[PDB]
């Protein structure tokens, strides 16, 4: 079982809930919000990375009779629904309420309470048609490689995400973000943008608080498997399917960490800092170290490459997008694969922001 | 005509595999028997297809037919009137007024959805979708026919995607039925590997096979006389390729080669409480391959072990990643897919098939 | 000028109409059927080889106001309404009828009477249901190279067609199939599946009767050309346009025929017979002869390839996609081009069925 | 400034209009026809080379309110229109008329008066769907390379056009064809089928008459450019755009002409004549001459290639698409670029008909 | 409120052509479309929304082109009784007590059964040279300059400006009252639109914020410096991500300034273009070779240098005809050298002349 009520008590307005596959995190987040959506004149936005995730989604059953029964209990009554017209009719507290699903929106008493959006299509939703939105739920935020073999994150995904947060949330203090992931691993833009490094010790804690967001890990429910049912036995016989259920933390993609004293081969100035790559000669080949330097101390003659022309100065060489791909592509490949040593987790996150921001 | 799912439903098993009997209207009869439940027992149905086009090209309009309503409800069916332009059917059963409307990928009976159309290719994205009262799931054309379709490929880790859909479509429902309908029956398909069924001519002769979790039935085309007064029938008989198709359900069952090799395998992969090994035996013409299964790592101290799962990875085993499996296991998978390797026994062949299809790439 | 009224009187239920481009073969076949579709509760299916043929087709103009008037004459009236809804409101015998065309269907009084289908997509519609189809029209059955530069027949097209006949036609004695071709030539799967060899002698006769089907040839009507009209004079000056009207039978793709005594290099067992290819060394290079042998007499040690695993036996070599491409790809190309000798037209038809059944693109 | 009243008065029924960019030739031609379409029970067909030219065309605004006012003046009144449903309602002479534009048709009082067709889609259309067509307008008949960078003529375009003329016009003496081109140049299929060789001397006259058609040249008006308007000033500053206005006759693609006595290397029999290519060895390389021979005199042993199997005879070698691409593909390219010598303009037009009829691309 | 950019100041000026660059996320399209509404709704004038590529329009949501907030902002109190049908994508509302409905179908938006907005793609503009647009008063070319960040390899149309000018003629016929709005999120040189206008982008102009020319006016939109609340976590998260923060001020990150130098020696080749002669000079240097792009008003001291003429009509004397096949063989490398900042231009004026020539004849 899982509920958002505990997190909503905390001051933080941003939550990352990872794990607990099949525990209905999306059901519970939507259910707890209902009272606000129905009667506090606030909306919700359901976000997905790709349009296909929403086009194939069954909007009509996003809100269910059972969901209304669980969250409103006895107050819920007189349920009658016309699935053919995507209309739900019921009574709460004796009042008559009707829920209608149209195109990519859900309406409660002729007022939109849920908006369905795809990050791929975020650019066209630049119109501010989101006045009353109080909740944003980004389901399946982290790609599952097991379930999907070749799913790719959006180019500069976090920048696209942050733009959508701003468009939907405008000078609105009362706003909430609920990123939900079935799988938790490192080396994803969402983790880099947040600044969160996933470690087994944090998973053991189960709850993690940070300056701008809160991270929670959900333990998969130990529900018994009925062996009288053949379908349960069939699933148990297939190991790949059975392992999937508990594969949330199968691999967290921990990176290699090592320290190299020697000065770096090259530097790139990004975000008030200089990122450096150091090559160490070893008999087999080369050992790569990725480092961050706060100031250009002891690096007088090392060339500095600047992605941004506006902040370009002194003897730095302007690196254009085509020129940058020519040289840092191999270094980027080394970063994507766990083939380089990182000075510390803090440095690893700075490098991740740069790679994913500029990745092509 | 003669085949009906009434006999299978009498059996306790809730999972059925129906092979053969092409053109016998297996889908038609399965849908008709369910109608009584869908119309009056408040249970929905899901029609499943491997690819979206299989559904996009499907005529949802005629999925339920007037003849179908008449045959299964007989005299109780009356006053049939339909507006095909608006995809609306209006009829009477037992004196009540019922209207069937088909819109997009759903069919509605009296304002209640009774049939859902879904494609396994798009199943992954609908892992959160809700289907309240589904009692029947029908996977038509479960086994690809190479003759009818030249180059159709199974989905990556297809059986896992199917099992996830079973869980999504079926949630805490003891009363559920799954129907797998295949016009062609052959080995070397993921559906057969996931079930654990090895197709053999001996089983086909019996015509009925029962297993712990599922039941398999084979439909033999009736050797019915062909009316020669009709010209269309005569034209088909003259064409051998078309005529063979009628009885080509079991033309080739893709039986694999079996032999035993004593020597130790070249490499090992740890899968499902066991170790799978590949053995290479040098022969003058070229090389010989043997696929074996070892219950324990006894006498295999220094043989390299590949582990698919990082969580259970330990000691000196090599982690199996998409890049690593392609480098080493790409050729071996091709050798397995083609009937180019020796298998210790049919039991081992099924173990290898699950592993190959789970990690196979395309 | 041409209509299928005469053919429908005949007992045969399968007809092949070749030639007569611009004679409204589609119109007359569709017009004569109307009485059945409108009042006899029978549907029609319009078939095309490729989806592209139907996607570009204008379904709403499949039935025209002119069409209704010609076939129903005085009985038809009150056609002055078009509502942009694909609806045509008119009168026959005083009754009010409305024809609505939506997507790939045409509806008459809320009942679908015409279905548009592409043979490429027939495989996916094996489970599709067509309740009351009585007519199937395969228009432009034979590819026109001039009009269409590079159109390719479907793999095992005739088997796909026969399967579609079965799906569209189930337990129906009263069924009609119309194959309409603007051009008639050999070396096409449709002709091979039927068993018809196109010869100039048959075209002059104009009528050919067979066990399972009837073939009729439509000659473009001869007309004096009014030269007072400038448009006619302009056309006469362009030779290509003038040639096009009589180009229906310009080339019938006749193959070379010769008999070679020597034993064949290889044999393939197909359809209760053995097909053999014989290679004869000549100073310039090699000569090819395609032969059929009733029995394996005097061919004891020649290798035999069997396409069907079920009938495979003894020392025959299993024929799979890899094996046939390795050995039969060049032979199939030699067959497609008029580069081999055939024992007789009968043997040529046997080889054509085999090539097209197993050919890959 | 320009109207087709003068051309319609002339006996010729086929007209080619070149030049006069921005003079609203299509607008004015459509307006003059209206009286016939509205009250004389005759339809019109608007033709374009490619489908998008029509798909992107605004059918609703093909006939405009301003156009009705201009052509009917005071008689036009009580205008009310629903653009959302593409319906126009107005009164002419006190009567109530409504124009409905739906799909590829425009309806005037529930009678279609304009049909939109694309030559690419011409194959799909039959003569049944067009009862009373009196006007055919082929706009932008000659491709403009400045506005459209890479538009290609249809294969055997003139034959496709002539077939469409026959389909749209059947046994109709009262028919008119308008070919409208912003730019006029040689080496295009339409000019070749007509038989017209474009020369500057013809342009100066402004009017050219032939047996079957009439050619008129419209020069863009040399009216002063208002510099108070900023948009006009901006266009003048851009020379490429400014040149385009008067670029109708910028380059007429005149061919090179020379005579070579020696006999040709090869001959092809086309349209009751023999076309020959002569190669002359020169120190730099090779020189090409394209010739036409009325009779096979002095060419006894030169090989002759015949495209048409029906006319194939004696020792001529059959020409097929694969074979001709091997030999005539380079020659067609040498012809397309001004790299060959033509005996005379008459021969150039004969060679042009052959090249474009069999050209592939 | 005052923060957002609006074209009220621009409309007061006599100029009818405006170029607006920068101000991403300031609703330039929103405000321009909103101010026009009064004309579109009640002055019987239509609007045309232009985009370079068809995908830009096919993916565009026409239904949200006009929004309730736009109507409420621009009509203020007069706007009331807003009720829209989501199924039909029909908006219904009240202005001044009158009944108005905005319906969007296909590539058109209809106001009270009258089309007020047309969506057109410059790629498809060529074939619509005969199209009729009766009462268009506003033409808006949004995203006129391609953004490399948002779109990785989007190509300008061949001879784009000539295609654009032709579309202006088709949309605007004998209409003195016409307005053209060019909206760009990013501003840079080496683009065809800036070349056709004749505008050279320089940092000094951006600081001024306003630039006036004979036929057009250029304005630069600066993102309003609104303070960022750091108590809100969402704001802090955005500040931590430099890429998101940089994107707001990346309008003028790189203006692609060209290199300029003068070479005395006579040019290797000449092309006669637009009543002038363009010459390319190659200078041998130890490292390799150096390129200079020059313009000569007259053929003085260039007697024997070959001249290439694109236009047959003005071809004369010993000039060599320039044809599509000939130009590709030699000017392909030169066009590439120009596209990259690898050549020296005599001055910004010459660079603009060279840009007109390159893009007119450029191929892709």
Author numbering:
A (entry chain B): 8 to 367
B (entry chain C): 7 to 368
C (entry chain D), D (entry chain E): 8 to 368
E (entry chain A): 5 to 368
Show me the paper's own sentences about this structure.
Two crystal forms of gp11 were obtained: (i) tetragonal crystals belonging to space group P43212 and (ii) trigonal crystals belonging to space group P3221. While the three structures described here were determined in the absence of nucleotide, the active sites of ASCE ATPases are well characterized and can be accurately identified. Two distinct conformations of the Walker A motif are apparent in our crystal structures. One conformation binds either a SO42− or PO43− ion in the canonical β-phosphate position. The ion forms hydrogen bonds with the backbone of the Walker A motif in lieu of a β-phosphate, typically provided by ATP or ADP, which explains why the Walker A backbone adopts a conformation similar to a typical nucleotide-bound ATPase configuration. However, because the structure was solved in absence of nucleotide or nucleotide analog, it lacks any interactions mediated by the α- and γ-phosphates, ribose sugar, or adenosine base. Thus, this structure likely represents a conformation with mixed characteristics from both the apo and nucleotide-bound configurations. However, the crystal structure of asccφ28 gp11 ring reported here shows no such helicity in the N- or C-terminal domains. We suspect that we do not observe helicity in the crystal structures due to lack of substrate DNA imparting helicity.
We present the first atomic-resolution crystal structure of a multimeric ring form of a viral dsDNA packaging motor, the ATPase of the asccφ28 phage, and characterize its atomic-level dynamics via long timescale molecular dynamics simulations. In contrast, a close homolog of the φ29 ATPase from the related bacteriophage asccφ28 (gp11) has been shown to form highly soluble functional rings; extensive analytical ultracentrifugation and small-angle X-ray scattering experiments show that the ATPase forms pentameric rings in solution. Individual subunits within the ring are organized into two globular domains connected by a linker domain, each of which is nearly identical to the corresponding domains of the φ29 gp16. Like φ29 gp16, the N-terminal domain adopts the canonical ASCE ATPase fold, while the C-terminal domain is a ‘vestigial nuclease domain’.
